[PDB]
Design a protein around this nucleic acid. Sequence first.
RNA 1: AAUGA
RNA 2: ACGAGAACUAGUAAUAAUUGUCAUUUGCAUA
Lengths: 478, 184, 204, 204, 204, 193, 293
Amino acid sequence: MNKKNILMYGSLLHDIGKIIYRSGDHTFSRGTHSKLGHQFLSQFSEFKDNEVLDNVAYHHYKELAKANLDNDNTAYITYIADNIASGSGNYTTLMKDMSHDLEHKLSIKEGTFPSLLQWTESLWQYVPSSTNKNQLIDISLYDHSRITCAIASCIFDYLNENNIHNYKDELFKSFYQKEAFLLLSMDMSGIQDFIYNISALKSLRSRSFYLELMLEVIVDQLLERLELARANLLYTGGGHAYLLVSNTDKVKKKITQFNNELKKWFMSEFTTDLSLSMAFEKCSGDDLMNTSGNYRTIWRNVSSKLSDIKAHKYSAEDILKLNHFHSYGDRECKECLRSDIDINDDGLCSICEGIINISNDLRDKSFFVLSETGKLKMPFNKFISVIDYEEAEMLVQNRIYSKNKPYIGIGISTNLDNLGATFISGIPEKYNSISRTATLSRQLSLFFKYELNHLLENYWDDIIEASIYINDKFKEFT
Amino acid sequence: YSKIKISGTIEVVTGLHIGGGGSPVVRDLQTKLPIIPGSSIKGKMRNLLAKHFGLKMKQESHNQDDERVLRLFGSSEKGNIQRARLQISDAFFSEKTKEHFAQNDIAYTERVTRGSEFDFVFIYNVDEESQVEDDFENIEKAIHLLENDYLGGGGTRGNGRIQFKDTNIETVVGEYDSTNLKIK
Amino acid sequence: YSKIKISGTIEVVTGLHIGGGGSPVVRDLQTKLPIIPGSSIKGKMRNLLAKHFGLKMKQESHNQDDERVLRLFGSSEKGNIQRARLQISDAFFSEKTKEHFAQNDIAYTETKFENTINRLTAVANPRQIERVTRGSEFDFVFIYNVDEESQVEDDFENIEKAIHLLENDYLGGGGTRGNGRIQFKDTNIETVVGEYDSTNLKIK
Amino acid sequence: YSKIKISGTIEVVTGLHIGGGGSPVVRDLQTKLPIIPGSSIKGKMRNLLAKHFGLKMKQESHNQDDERVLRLFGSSEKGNIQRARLQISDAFFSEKTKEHFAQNDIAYTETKFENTINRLTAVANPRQIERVTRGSEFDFVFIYNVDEESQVEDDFENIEKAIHLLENDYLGGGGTRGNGRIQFKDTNIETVVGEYDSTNLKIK
Amino acid sequence: YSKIKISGTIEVVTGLHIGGGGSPVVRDLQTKLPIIPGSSIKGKMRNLLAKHFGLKMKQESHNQDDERVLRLFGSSEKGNIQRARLQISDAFFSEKTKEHFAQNDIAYTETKFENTINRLTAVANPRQIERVTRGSEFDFVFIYNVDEESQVEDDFENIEKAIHLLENDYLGGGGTRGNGRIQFKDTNIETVVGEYDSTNLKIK
Amino acid sequence: YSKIKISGTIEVVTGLHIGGGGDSPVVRDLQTKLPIIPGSSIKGKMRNLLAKHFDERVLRLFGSSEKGNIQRARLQISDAFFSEKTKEHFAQNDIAYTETKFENTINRLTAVANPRQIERVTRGSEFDFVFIYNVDEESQVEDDFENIEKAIHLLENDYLGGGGTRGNGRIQFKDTNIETVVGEYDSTNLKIK
Amino acid sequence: TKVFKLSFKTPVHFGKKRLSDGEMTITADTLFSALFIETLQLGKDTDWLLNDLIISDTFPYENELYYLPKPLIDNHKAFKKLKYVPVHHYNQYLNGELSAEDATDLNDIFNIGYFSLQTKVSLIAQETDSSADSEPYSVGTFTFEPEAGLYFIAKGSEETLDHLNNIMTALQYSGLGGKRNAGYGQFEYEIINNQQLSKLLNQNGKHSILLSTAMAKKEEIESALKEARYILTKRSGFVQSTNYSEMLVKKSDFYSFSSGSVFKNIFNGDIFNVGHNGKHPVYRYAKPLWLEV
RNA sequence: AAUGA
RNA sequence: ACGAGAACUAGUAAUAAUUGUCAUUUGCAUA
């Protein structure tokens, strides 16, 4: 077991004794939440990682103050990440269900961490994160745990990459001010132009799906290349991906390499109608925390460098290679109108034909599989193909993409006006942290992707009625 | 509503000259033989009966008469309706007189020759059962006065006095007993 | 459903003044000869045969009549619909009368001069009035519809009584002073439409 | 398919008062003479021929009537499809009457004065009625559609029944007082469209 | 490719009520005078000439007709398109007639008053109908296309049959009750475009 | 190289119905709400008529340019608009610009009728029009103008729009002027009626 | 350095990718195309105007007002909804003297026409033969208010501009768009010299704003993009009379800067060849027309 | 002419 | 050498079928 996994596992579930204390189960609701959680998890055989127990038992001040641990043990880094992130019978039923699931369904070995993540999400996406009387808790327990993990992994990448081994002395304010970690942004252009390149009315959801799936694939790939997990991804959608990484030389070099590969591939697949831009601004432990309102400044600076990169998105060699002659005269795509690609007999190019077939299959089948060879093109010579449910579990027995289906334990799966003020400000004072933008993004995504479908399940005049309803609902929203 | 009838004959003694022409005598142009307008007898009996009872000068100005004349004879022009209860019909000769004159070869015009007979037929409607006796005794009085006066124009020199004979009081429509009446 | 015809002659004995042109006499404009409008006969008969039966003062105020009169004549005014069952047409000079008056050189009208003598002044005021020559004959027709197989006998008895009362009266105007006395003659009954038995009916 | 023509003259016996504009009469305004509209003829014939056959109170309620009546005059209202088989045209004041009336100086219109006597009051109210003159004539044309080859005889029998009934009744208004009696003369039958025979057909 | 023109005069015999407003008559709104729409004429000729030849129940259902009828008026819906050959334009009030009417002061429109008598209750209800005056004239124009040389004589024979049938029928509504009779006069045939002689052709 | 302009007016004899929106809704402008005759309508109707009359003439004058040979259009037809005279006269006399016609349909075998409405441009209105001809060959202008004259004749004796077999669309052409607007070619002798 | 004013009176069709598209303005390449075709049509010489004329984009105007494209130099929400800036405020725009409320009022006042999808049919198909389905299609049109229209800028010597006068006088009877032979896109023009236009065109600064679409030559591209802010837009389309099949002839794709570009280092342009397997060359215009502020 | 549907 | 160029919002259907300006009403009462 690599120690990164040890920190990550002791990180997601480090705050579960709080639920076992809210549930009122008299067996394990008498002491402090850390030891309640440790006592609960000290049952199951799979979760018997010793250092994970050490991680989960002491994620607070006094616990480490009286535990005299060794110099290299993740409880200190757990403490630091927890701090930076921080800035009635139904619970009893939930903990019965939790016991059953933990002793039966899940696996603990390496690579089971994404499955554990979906499990925690599907269970905890509504538990009240805290009931503090002096605070307004607009967050779920899922967000606290997940962002604690993301911060923990980034702090570890920073501390380890610079060859420090005395974690205790280094981390037990002075460190909080160092330019420790980074904020990273992906924005893809040309969505509006590409989404309206169809010649009827319901067909403009398949290519919407294609854009969304590409964004998710590229971001999951990026996380894999950097030996963290999908914990470290704050927001996705629209055309945006807001992510958090560490401030070290190695990750910077790898980000540059990935950028070059993506630029090359996007140019290869599409001439210029679809791009991808990546910009990163360094931040300290203080910046994400609310100290001097600097979070707005960070966000504005990232947007600024993004605009600049948009202004100069090519170089001279690229523009000369673009203006180099190529064969023409052959017919163009009947729906997509581009004459640089070999065409099939039916009159559609590879990508547009793939999209129409995948929409026809999606109307019936509902699992997507990322393979080496298959149907629709993806980055780095990968393809997506369509499969059905039982087929999905057989393939899992031997990455899978779904549509708003919280299936857990089946290997590794990924379930798929005044906006500027909400995205940049959020809560200006006393709550200006990365966690607040995390929860705000989650709630907005739930409204946009799931609640909109529920509203439209019952659906010129209709357009006006929907506009009025949306305006009224948004007025109620704020 | 019962229709009682009166009928009778009238005898001519003084050479009569009515004056229906306005010097000839009024003739129905079917037989060229003398007649008598019913307005003649109606008006003359009316005037005699009105004179017999009280006649006011103010009523003379306004053509108003006694209630008896307004009922029996009837005027119905004062704003109070009085439909007449005594239909007088025009009188013709009798075939007896015609046969006698033809046998004796005597002309009719001199003036109305003497010895004639006239068939007068009156129809009396019974609009009220009670007043029948009063109405008929009044008619009897009027008949007597007519018998003792003159009918015609310019008769104040010896012409126009005539006699009544041979009556018959028969009910022609109705179921009322009309046996106790008399008009001489 | 059937329709019987009643026909005959009206014979006038005394003066007949109708004056519908009013003092002339109403006259056809195509032959220039007098007529008796059927309106006059229908109205006179209605008034006689209606006065005979009950004639209430309250009914007089509301112009309501006895049921027999309305079934024989029809009012349809009180909200109860009653269509007339007896149809009366006009009258015209018969051919024999025309031939007789033409051969005898006798006219069709008499001009009567009447004198009014007024009270308290004795001023003679003259007048001229036109009358139809006595002894002429008119041709008349009534049409009788059958709407109920039973009531024919009662209806014909009533029409008999109506003819009787009219024959003891005067027709037209100027009656209470010597004009209007007529009678009926040569009455005939002949069923002209339908399949009804009306050979025992008798109009005198 | 065939259309057959009937034609003839209407003879006015007593006064006719349609009064379509109403007390005036109904007149053209290119010539200003009386006419007889086809609507009145159709309605009166239909009412006679319906009453002659059965008339039920429920059938009285909604103008539901005998089958032959609807076959010859048309309903197509109760979800059963039946358009009229007899086309009736208007009657126009004829030329021979115009010539005769012009050269004898006889007008086309009588003006009759009428009187009403009130009950228990004996007050007269006068009225004026404008009647078409006697002795007139009019011209009429009917068109018969042959929609079925085996009903022509029956439909013509019903038509002659209607004509006979109307020759014993009145056309117009106020006929129960002597108005509207008519006659039919000079009837000719021709087949205008088709190859159908009309030598055995007759209407009296 | 030739086009043949036919022009002439429609004369109103009895009152006419196209009455397309719903009771008004259709009017041009630059002159305020009556007009005869051409779709009326085409529809009536379609119905009449179709019923002339065999009209079947199955041919009743689908609004398909004989091959000749489809040829002259067009089908172009049956999955076997048929282009028409006879284009019917509207007809408008003539200037001669408006001159005459203004000179003699004759109003262009009649308002006939009509009545209905219901059964069981005999309570009438009245109504008003506007209608064009008789003696009016309208000017009509037809265009016929020579899509094939050898069918011209047959097509004009069929149009002559339609003219005969329509002249013994009615245009507009209330045709069975009198309204709407027409005649055609003063016709003329000319080859307005092309090189097809039309001297032997005639429509009566 | 010369360009020639043929200008004039077209008058509506019986009601007109183009009805691109439908079928009642007649084509207008979406701001001034005044009826117009699109030039594609005239071009297509003239093409159909002239083709029925007869080829290389239709191809040289209206242009095909994809049949394996490429011919460029030699006559340009523009849209037509309401004229000032007609607007003034109608405004004074208080007349609407458009009529609504009510019609009916009859079922065979059922004799039940059901209605329709057709909106239709008023009688007597006027429109102004201009055509352009580009003189690409000097020895052909007489032939091209003979053909254009024939097309206008045929369209005069025919209909524009929809529902013309039942009585709509008839038009006339008045007040022609033929002026040479670019170049020095003599077009004071041409006639189009 | 004269300017040309154009008023249309009829709707126009410019379009981007399909006939369903409707666009307000066109590009210097489309007008260079128009002028070149008209010169070859009139029988004159293209040599003089191939390498002596500088043209700019088309721009909108209203009653007494002029607009220019947005240069690529706090609210960051209202400016992004703006495409053109009035001339009187142009300098004030580049110095940061324009406020949000003024910009919003500008957005309010900038209505200079509207859009319309005209639907049509085609019966030239087997409809001539027999039963065959009709083919409804759609064209997109833009319509101006009575006092709006287009203006252009052209510069050089007097002789070249006299030639341009003649060319516009001839051209005003053909069209400037798509379905020209169907009745769309004619105009009347006037030649204008406004004072403030000359004042803006004769500034003095350090940067440069592009009023056309142009591309750098090879030997200068490396020095053109030292410090620049630009947009690349692919420009493709079909030709008018190169070879036999129209479909087999379609221009090779080209990329060029847009009309709000800002360049620290100037470049001259070139007229670029975009022909291949044709009989005669097909030119794209790419030569910049600067304003230096 | 009077009052109606 | 202008996202170009060929391209009639066409085609079949009307104003319908049934309906009484009718029911009651004396140009009449006095010399």
